[PDB]
Design a protein around this ligand. Sequence first.
Ligand SMILES: */C=C/C(=O)Nc1cc2ccccn2n1
Length: 305
Amino acid sequence: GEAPNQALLRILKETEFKKIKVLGSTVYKGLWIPEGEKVKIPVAIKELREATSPKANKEILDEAYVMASVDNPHVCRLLGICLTSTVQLIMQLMPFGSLLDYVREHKDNIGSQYLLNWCVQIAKGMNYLEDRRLVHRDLAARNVLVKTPQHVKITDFGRAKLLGAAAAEYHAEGGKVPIKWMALESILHRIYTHQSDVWSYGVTVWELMTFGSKPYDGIPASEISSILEKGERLPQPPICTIDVYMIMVKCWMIDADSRPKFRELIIEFSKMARDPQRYLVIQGDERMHLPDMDDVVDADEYLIP
Ligand SMILES: */C=C/C(=O)Nc1cc2ccccn2n1
């Protein structure tokens, strides 16, 4: 017996927005003018290419279902869909792209305050998903986006699943899967919970603290289940005090109920964010700084009743 989902799905006319340029391959940087509102909202437009794959259309509409039903500052905002030949998702533009690409590009300019605040913001995002009984199943530094260096959001709800009325764990049957981020119980038994999401939070934090290194780089995915069974885990990043690493390591416990809760991760990373140089040791951390448009509003200041 579940709460009804009264999220609004907004259908947009193709004339309400203009593609300005291409970001990925498709995803476009563009501008959205809501019908007679005198606002310009910078948007990312995810447009299906194939469009004659019925399967592809079920996939994109699940993303849209999930993104319509989440409203949190640390989770990507869907603004609407457009039902042209090619189905278009209109989202808040996240100008600095993925946090994975951002920490690789800016290894040299990123202080402890930013890393730990990112750890908090993704924990807030994930705790909110948990409140909404939602399991992400694909948390990774690639699936967190940068609105500003101060503000990130969890994205890619492609794999996200809601637990049922009494559905504690979730059960799936195949596809291309991100082994190197998955909980042991997920790889062996396709078991997914908020606690399997905490495993992946652990790996996501290891990616940030190693400025975007590949987890278990040059190890085959077939080997990963055995290595974890053997009790091997990702190594302590150079910048990490034992306090930060010990938190990552608890997210990688075999007993899923022994892992921290997202709410606890918010707390531990906040405590550490209050005194960042005590918890991460970075060369020259002390000298680190990062960042008609008249009716432009960020989507975060564009609210619908
Ligand atoms: C979280 C919504 C979203 O997809 N926004 C987004 C995607 C993307 C790709 C590349 C550069 C900027 N981007 N913003």
